[PDB]
Amino acid sequence: MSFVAYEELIKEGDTAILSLGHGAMVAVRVQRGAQTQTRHGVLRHSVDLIGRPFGSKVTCGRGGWVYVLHPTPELWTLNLPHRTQILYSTDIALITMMLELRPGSVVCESGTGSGSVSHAIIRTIAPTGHLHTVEFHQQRAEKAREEFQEHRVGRWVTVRTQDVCRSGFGVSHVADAVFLDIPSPWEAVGHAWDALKVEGGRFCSFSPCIEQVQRTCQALAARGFSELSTLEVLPQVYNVRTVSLPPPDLGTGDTSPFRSGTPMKEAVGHTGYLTFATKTPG
Amino acid sequence: MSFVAYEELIKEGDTAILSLGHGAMVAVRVQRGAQTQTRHGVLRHSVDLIGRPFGSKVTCGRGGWVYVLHPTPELWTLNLPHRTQILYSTDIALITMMLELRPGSVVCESGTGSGSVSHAIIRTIAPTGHLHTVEFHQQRAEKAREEFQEHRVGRWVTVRTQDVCRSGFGVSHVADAVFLDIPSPWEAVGHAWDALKVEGGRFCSFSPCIEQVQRTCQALAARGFSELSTLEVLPQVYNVRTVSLPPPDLGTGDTSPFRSGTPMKEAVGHTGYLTFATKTPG
Amino acid sequence: HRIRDGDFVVLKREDVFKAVQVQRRKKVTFEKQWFYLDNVIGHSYGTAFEVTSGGSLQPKKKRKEAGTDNRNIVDDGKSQKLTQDDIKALKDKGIKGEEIVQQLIENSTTFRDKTEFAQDKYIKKKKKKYEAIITVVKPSTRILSIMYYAREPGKINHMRYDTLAQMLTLGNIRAGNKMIVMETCAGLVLGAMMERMGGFGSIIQLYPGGGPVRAATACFGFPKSFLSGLYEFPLNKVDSLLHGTFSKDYIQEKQRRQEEQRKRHLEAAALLSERNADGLIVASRFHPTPLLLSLLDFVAPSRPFVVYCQYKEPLLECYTKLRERGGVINLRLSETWLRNYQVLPDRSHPKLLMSGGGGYLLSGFTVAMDN
Amino acid sequence: HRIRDGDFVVLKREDVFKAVQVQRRKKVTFEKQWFYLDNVIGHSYGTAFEVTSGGSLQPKKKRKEAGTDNRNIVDDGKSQKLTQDDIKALKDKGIKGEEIVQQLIENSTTFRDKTEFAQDKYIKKKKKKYEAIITVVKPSTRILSIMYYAREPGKINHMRYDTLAQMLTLGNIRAGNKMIVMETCAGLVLGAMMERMGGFGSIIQLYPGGGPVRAATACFGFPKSFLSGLYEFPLNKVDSLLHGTFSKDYIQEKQRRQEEQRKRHLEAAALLSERNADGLIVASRFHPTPLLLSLLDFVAPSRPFVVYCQYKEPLLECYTKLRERGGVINLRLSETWLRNYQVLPDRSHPKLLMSGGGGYLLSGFTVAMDN
RNA sequence: GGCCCGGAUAGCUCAGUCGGUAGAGCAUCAGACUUUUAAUCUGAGGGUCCAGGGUUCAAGUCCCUGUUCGGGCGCCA
RNA sequence: GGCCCGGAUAGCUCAGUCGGUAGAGCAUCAGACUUUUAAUCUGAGGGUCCAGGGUUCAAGUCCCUGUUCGGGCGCCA
Ligand SMILES: Nc1ncnc2c1ncn2[C@@H]1O[C@H](CSCC[C@H](N)C(=O)O)[C@@H](O)[C@H]1O
Ligand SMILES: Nc1ncnc2c1ncn2[C@@H]1O[C@H](CSCC[C@H](N)C(=O)O)[C@@H](O)[C@H]1O
Ligand code: NA
Ligand code: NA
C-alpha cells in the first residue's frame, strides 16, 4: 500500500500482489502470523513479506520464488473478489479521460458493484477529490465499505445504500462527473443532472445492450444534455513469438524465420457501449 | 468478355477494364471507331484494343501505356456506374458462401439497384442457374436489363419491375436462396418464404441500421425461418512500406529498418449487417 | 433431397458441428453422447433428433410473475431445494429432461424473484444441458468451413470461414475454369473450389509428400462426376516441369495404382505446361513466396491469384518479390474481421469480433511480362 | 469558470476542433471563416456563437407530409427551382441562413415526396453548411487529444486518443508521482500527465535537440504552480549520467537563460540519479528500444512503464530485449480499437472502426534485478 | 469550333502507372553557431480536403454544374 | 486430524515462473521403403474444454460443492 501513494516497504495490513509466472497473480492481505500457499511454495508473511521492499524476488519454500508488486487499481482490478461482473482497465481508461477526471474532481457513481471502477476513480481524484457512490444491494454496499477501509481510502469515498433511480446519488449540484453502470440508466439521467454542478459537468453510462443505449440517449437529450457520443473500445493483446514456415519441396536442390505479434485470443468480446454527454447551463 | 467465361482476345462489344496505375481503373465498352482518353494518353479501340489479348500492356499516345484486364464481377463492381449505393466484394463474398450459391442455384433478389450483387450471383450460378431479381424503380430496372444484354448474361437473369413487399419476387417455390437489400426487408420475409422451394433454402438480408435487423429477425422467426445468424464483415487493407525509425541521441558515440503492413485508412466504415436464416419443411 | 444411408452429413447441436458418414449399425460420439444413426433416414434435412439408450428418435421441429431488480437477491447457495445427489436420480431414472428443467425451476426459490430476462436465461441454460437436440444437415462449404475453423483450426492453418469466402470471390472461382491449387488445409479449400465449379472445368491440385489430403473434401459428398476434371501432381516435380526436364495379388494391386497414378500425373503435367490456367489458389503451412514465384508461371495473363497465410510478414516479402518479378497488377494485401451479433428484444449486442487469427490474403491479377 | 481574455480555449464546430488563445482585437480562422474573439467573454463555457462581417454574436443554446418509398423519384437534376447564381445573391445579401435553408426546402419539388428520414437528412446537411455555429469550450486532455489526432496526427505520431488514455492508466499516472517522460508528441502526452498529477509530484522531461516541445502543453492553460515540479533534461547527456561522467542587453539575456537552464538541468540530473522514479512514459518518432533500455535504469522497482509506438515491429524487438535484460515482469504488447456509433430512432449503427492507425503499447512493471 | 481525361485541404506552392495524399517544400519563428540591415545548420508551429446543387436506405469508393490549373484527340461525338 | 494452493477438452496420456493450452506424444491408419505373424521413415485422421448447482445487467477473466490427479503447511485457521 497505499493505493493512493507509493511506499518502498511492505507493512502489515497492506494488500500485496504476488506474480506467479505467466500473467497469473493473486492478491494477499499481509498479516503477521499468516501463510499463503502458491504453486511455488509457502510464504510466511512475518519473515518473507513484512519489512521487505515491493518489487523483490521472494523465495518461498523448496527454493521456489515469486515477485511481490505494489498495489494499483489496475492490479487490483485483476485480483479483486468479484461480487459482480466488473469493468476492466481498457474501459476504465477511456471512461476516466472522457469524464475529464483529475485530482480534485467530485464524482458520482452507481452501482458500486465490486469496486473496480471505484478504486480507479479514487486513485485519480485524490487527494482533494471525492467519490459519492451508490449501491442498492445491502451486502455489496457493506463489502465495498469494508474494502475501502482496509485499503485506507475511506477519506475519498462515501457509499450510500439506496436506489439511484428513485433517491438519486445523495448529493446535489456538487459533481464534475457522473458514471453509471446499472441495468436501467435512463431512469437515473435526471438524478445525474441534479448531481452535477450547475456550472456543468460530464456524464458517462455503460450498457451491454444497444436498446439500453437508445433509451439513455433519448433521456439525455430530453433532459438537456449535449455533446452526446456513444463509443466502444476493444482491447487486443499480442503474444510475441518466433515462427518459421518450412520451405516447400519443389524438387530443387527466402524462408527465414520472423518475429510476430499474434493475438492471444482469436476473438475479442463485447463489454459494453459507453455513452458520454455534457451538462452546460442554458 | 464474357462475364461468364474467359476469352483470350478482346472483341467488339466487350467490356474491358483499363488499369491506369495505383489502383485506379476505368471500364470501357469496346467499339470500332471509338476513342478513350486516359491520363496516359488516347486509346483507339480499332487498333489498340480489338484483336489484342487481355492482360497486355497497351501503348496509348506519346509513349504512355495501360494494362487491359478481362472483365469479372469484382472488377465490374469497382467500375460500374452507380445508380445506387452498391455492395462491395467483401460483403458479396460472404453473402455468396452463406447462401450456399453454386452452379445451378436459383436465386431471388431485391432490389436490383446497380447490379453489383446481380453480376456476382450470375457468375456463380451459371450455366444452369437463374436469377429472378426485382426492382420497383422503372429506370433502374431498365438500366439493369440493358447492362445484362450488353454483358451477354440475359439468359441467366429476369428483372421484374414491381414492389417485392406487395407482389413478391414473381416466382413461387423455385428458389434455393433469397437476397434482400431494401429499406423494409421485414415486409418481404413472407414473400421470401413463398419464393424459396418447399424443400427449403437460404435467406439473407442486408441492413445498415440495427432496428431494421431487429424487425427482420422478428419477422423471420414468426414465419418459421430457423438458424438465424446476424453477421458483419469488415475489410482491412494494408500498404506495404519500408520504414526506418531514427535512433535517439543519448550522447553515445538495434535500429534496423523493417517492412510493415500499414492500413490504408485509419478507420474502417460500416456497410451493413447481414442476417441469414434457413427455411426447412415442418 | 432426403436423408439416405451412405450419405455424408453433418450433425449439429447448438452451434457445434461434426461431420460423419451414415452407416447402418455404426456407433459415433457427439458432444458427450453415443448414437446410432440407423433411425435417421427418409427424413428431410434440417430434421431434429434426441438420444436415448443408444438410438435417436424424431421429435417435432418446433415446441409468468417476475421481479424488476436484484437488490434483494442474496447468494446463500441454498436457492435450489434439491441435491446434487437427487439430480443423478432423475437422470438415471431416464426421465424426459424437460421435466427435469421444470423441476429445477419449481425448486428454485429465487426464480420467481428474478427478472424476466434472467428467467429466460436461466431456462435456456438448463435446456441446453438437459434438452439435447441434434439436427442433421447437408454438407456445404458454409457448414464445413465453420466446423473446421471451430473443431480443427490447426488443420486448416487457422483460415477462418469469411477468409475462405474472400478467396473464392477474389479468385473468380466459377464453372468452366482451369484452376490450380496448392493446399494443406485437409482438402477444404479444394472442396470449396469444387462446390463453386459444379463439375465444370478442371482443377489441378499440387500436393506435398506422397499424396493430396482430401479428408475434408470427402465430407462434401460430391458425385463421382466431379472427379473426372480433378487432377493431381506432385509439388516436388514442379521445378523439372518449368525447365522441361520432367520425365501376390496386392503386389499387383499396387502396380495397378502406381501406373494409374503415374498416368494421371502425366495428364496433369501436360495441362500445366500449357501455362494457360485461369487462376491460382495457395493456402498451406509452407512459406508461400517460393510457391507463388514458381506456380504463377502456369497461369495465363489477366487472371486472378490468391495467396493465404496465417501470418502477415511472409506476405509482405511475397509482395515485394512479386514486384521484382513483375507480371502482376493490382496487388492487394488484405484481412477480414468478422463480428457476430445477438439479436433479441431489448437484448441486442455484438458477441465476438474475430480478428487476427483468421489469416491474411495477398491477391492480384496476372499480366503479360515485358519483352 | 467563465470565459475571460487571455484564456486558452478550444473552438468547436460540429466535431471539428481548433485551439486558440483569446486576445482582444486578434483575427483567427476557423473552418473557412474570419473571427474576432473580442465578443466572446463573460459567457459560460459551452456557449455558442455565430459569425458576421468579422465579429461573433451570442445565439440561444437551443432552438410535415412525406412519402414512403423512392420508387418514383427521378433524378432530372431540376428538383431545386433556384439557381447556382441566385444562391450567392441570398448570401451576399447577408441573410440569416436558416431562411436560406427554408428557401431551399420550399424550392425543392421532391422534398415533400421524400421519406421523413431523408427529409431530416436533407435539412441537417443544409444547416451544417448555412447555420455555422461555433461553441467555445475549455481545454482538457479529452478535447486536445481528439483535436490533435484529427488535425495534426503526424505531430503526435498518430497516437489516437483512446491509446493515450490507456497509457495514463497503465502507467498509474496520479498525484504525488515522480514521473519520467520522453515525448515528441508536441507536449500533448506531457500535458495529459500534468492534468492527472494536478500539480502534485514531479515530472522529468527528457528532450532531443535544443529543447522540449510544449506547444500542445500550452493549450491546456495550466497555472504557473504546475511548473514548479516540471523539470527538463537533454537526452544526449543520458549516457553520461548513467556512468556518472556527467558535468548588448540581450547577449546578457541569453547568458541569463543559459545558466538558468543549466541550473535546472543539474537539479533534474540529481533527481534522475536517485534512480527511484515512479514510472516511465515513452512516445516518440525515435526507435524506442534504446530509450527503454537506458531510461528504465532511472526507475524504481515495482513501477509501471509504458512505451508507445506507431508500429508494432519495433515493440516486438523491445519485448525480446527487455526479456534479455531482465528487471521487468507482466510484459504486455497491446493495441486498442475504437468504434463510434450513430444512435438515433430507427437509425442506429456504427460509424467508424478506428484500427491499426492509432498505435501500439508495450507495458509492464519493473522488478529488482538478480544479484 | 468543340469533345474526352485528370487535378484543387496549411499563408503560398507541390506530391510517384508498386492498389503512395496527414507526405512535404517555400516562407515564417525558435535554438545553436559566426560570418551579424544578416548567414548557416538543426528543429518547431501551420491540415479536416475548391464552391453550389441533385441523388443512394435509415452506410458513399455516386452524379451534374460553376471557378481555376494541367494533359490529350481533332474540326469528328 | 485438518487447512491452504494448482490441474481435468482427442481412444489413452501430457504440455514451460517470457502475461505459452487449437500445442503435442502414445497408439491407430495410409504412403514410401526392406528387413515382411513385421520393421523403419514420412505423413494423415482424431479438439469445443470433468460433472452438478448458485450468482453478475439484459457481456464472465465469478463463486460453491462432488469426482479424480498432483504440490505445500503442520496437528495451528
Ligand atoms: N437502481 C440502482 N441503484 C443502486 N445500485 C444499483 C441499481 N441498479 C443496479 N445497481 C447495482 O449496480 C451494480 C452493477 S455491477 C457494477 C460493477 C462496477 N462497475 C465495478 O466495476 O465493480 C450491482 O452491484 C447492482 O446491485
Ligand atoms: N419494395 C421494393 N421493391 C423493389 N425494389 C425496391 C423496394 N424497395 C427498395 N427497392 C430498390 O432496392 C434498391 C436498393 S440499392 C440495391 C443495390 C444492389 N444491392 C447493388 O449492389 O447494386 C433500390 O434500387 C430501390 O429502388
Ligand atoms: Na491551397
Ligand atoms: Na482426457
Textual characterization of the structure:
Chains A, B: Belongs to the class I-like SAM-binding methyltransferase superfamily. TRM61 family. Chains A, B: Heterotetramer; composed of two copies of TRMT6 and two copies of TRMT61A. Chains A, B: It comes from Homo sapiens (Human). Chains A, B: Its main location: nucleus. The complex is a heterotetramer, with 2 copies of chain A (282 residues) and 2 copies of chain C (371 residues). With 282 residues, chain A is α/β, with parallel strands linked by helices. Chain A folds into 2 domains: 72 residues, Vcp-like ATPase, Chain A, domain 2 (Roll); 210 residues, Rossmann fold (3-Layer(aba) Sandwich). In chain A, 24% of the residues lie in helices and 30% in strands. Chain A contains 8 helices and 15 strands. In chain A, helix 5 links the parallel strand 8 and strand 9. Chain A starts with 14 loop residues before the first strand and ends with a strand. Chain C is of the alpha/beta class and 371 residues long. Chain C folds into 2 domains: 52 residues, no CATH class; 213 residues, Rossmann fold (3-Layer(aba) Sandwich), CATH 3.40.50.150. Helix content of chain C is 32%, strand content 22%. Chain C has an 8-stranded mixed beta sheet, sandwiched between helices. In chain C, strands 2-1-7 form a 3-stranded antiparallel beta sheet, covered by helices on one side. The longest helix of chain C is centred in the last third of the chain and has 24 residues. Chains in contact: A-C, A-D, B-C, B-D. At the A-D interface, strand 6, helix 3, helix 4, helix 8 and strand 12 of A face helix 4, helix 5, helix 6, helix 11 and strand 13 of D. Bound molecules: S-adenosyl-L-homocysteine (2 copies) and sodium ion (NA) (2 copies). One S-adenosyl-L-homocysteine binds next to helix 4 and helix 6 of chain B. One S-adenosyl-L-homocysteine binds next to helix 4 and helix 6 of chain A. Chain C binds 2 RNA strands through helix 1, helix 3, helix 11, strand 13 and strand 14.
